[PDB]
Ligand binder design. Structure first.
Ligand SMILES: O=C(O)[C@H](Cc1c[nH]c2ccccc12)Nc1ncnc2[nH]ccc12
Length: 167
């Protein structure tokens, strides 16, 4: 959990312009969060990047979890192996606004982070899931009380997010 160079937004929320895959390799975190869907099919966005960085080990483990336990619910999570990226991967399902899901469940999705004293995470329901990323950061700040280190790949979004907090 060697986190450094994050902007400290609040007492417990940190943000950095970084690829979550590269941060995970650098930081060696206890927990990396996946922006998952309910059947843990890691096809695109953050999930695709994390799975490809494990050379599909995450997808094989995820398929076994689903076969045995069935799909997650929106706002839910499970803990699986972090493989080479982290000790654990917390797979968290935020609502997919682009596929017509409800923004109230974004708070429930972020509540899962409170089970872990420190996490490396993406912004939930952002990118291809279609939520306003600045709203997602506000929900994170209001909901998560443990130490969350947010990786935002796109420097422009990072600067927009920091500006919404500082200006
Ligand atoms: O820049 C990117 O492509 C993604 C976009 C994103 C933010 N939240 C998500 C939730 C689900 C799907 C996509 C997104 N953001 C990233 N942030 C940090 N590291 C990353 N590695 C790959 C994408 C990415």
């Amino acid at each position: 959990n060697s986190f450094s160079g994050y902007l400290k937004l609040t007492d417990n929320v940190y943000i950095k312009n970084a690829d979550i895959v590269e941060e995970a390799k650098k930081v060696k975190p206890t927990v990396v969060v996946n922006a998952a869907n309910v059947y843990l099919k890691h096809g695109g966005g953050v999930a695709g990047a994390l799975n490809k960085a494990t050379n599909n080990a995450m997808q094989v483990e995820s398929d076994d979890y689903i076969a045995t336990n069935g799909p997650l619910k929106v706002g839910g999570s499970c803990v699986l192996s972090g493989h080479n990226l982290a000790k654990h991967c917390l797979h968290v399902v935020g609502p997919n606004v682009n596929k017509g899901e409800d923004i109230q469940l974004l708070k429930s999705a972020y509540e899962n982070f409170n089970q872990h004293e420190v996490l490396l995470a993406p912004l939930l329901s952002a990118g291809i899931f279609g939520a306003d990323p600045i709203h997602s950061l506000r929900v994170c700040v209001d909901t998560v009380r443990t130490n969350v280190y947010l990786a935002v790949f796109d420097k422009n979004l990072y600067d927009k997010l920091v500006s919404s907090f500082l200006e």
